[PDB]
Amino acid sequence: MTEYKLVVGGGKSALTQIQNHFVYDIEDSYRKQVVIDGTCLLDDTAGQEEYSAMRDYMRTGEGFVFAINNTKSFEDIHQYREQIKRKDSDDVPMLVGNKCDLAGRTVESRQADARSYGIETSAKTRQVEDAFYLVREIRQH
């Protein structure tokens, strides 16, 4: 069957609410069998420092986060996109607005103007599949 490659930008893991739940805790692959929009097995990073050339996990994926309070994390976006574009392609199937149930955010929705490149998720309520089912882009790429 169709087997989907998913490789997700300090609440990414969080998302992966696979295990239906809500989790201070190197690498996790995960495998579930859904149906999306009509038999689909799904196939989680840590963006801390150390991995940089282990990252080039950008090679084996099809579809590819910030915290709405963390502007430097908004600002980490631009370092990222570059090493998956340089999957020598200027268009990869690919923006995660996590931590949206919170009450003092430094990255304004407005500013996530995404549209230059080509969702606001709460891993704490479940406002987690609306971002992932990215599978739909895989499905037209």
Add this chain to the structure above:
Amino acid sequence: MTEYKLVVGGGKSALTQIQNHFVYDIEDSYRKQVVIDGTCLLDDTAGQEEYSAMRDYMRTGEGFVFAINNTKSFEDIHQYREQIKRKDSDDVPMLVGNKCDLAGRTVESRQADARSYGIETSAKTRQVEDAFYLVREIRQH
């Protein structure tokens, strides 16, 4: 604020579960105030016979259904697309798979190959915003 124009293909109305609920019953405009992915007011047809040049409600919309058991309704898709493309545009922001909790379907997921044009919804369970929030396409058109 941003005011979104929405004009939806015998379970369309159904969808519009606006009123949070689940409904044998000419035209309904509807107005709700959400947030999608970061202040968004939302702005329902009957595809029976009579309206055809009243339809040309294709002029005042930005974003624009079948029943998974109804192949002739799958087959009504192609009549439709044409009069909103002829909004003299070959690319309009715009496929609804309704009646997906049921158990004998004549339109196979597989065949909704959508991808030529450019979701499977249950208005009976709530498997209703995943199709609509179409608003995201409006937002990059």
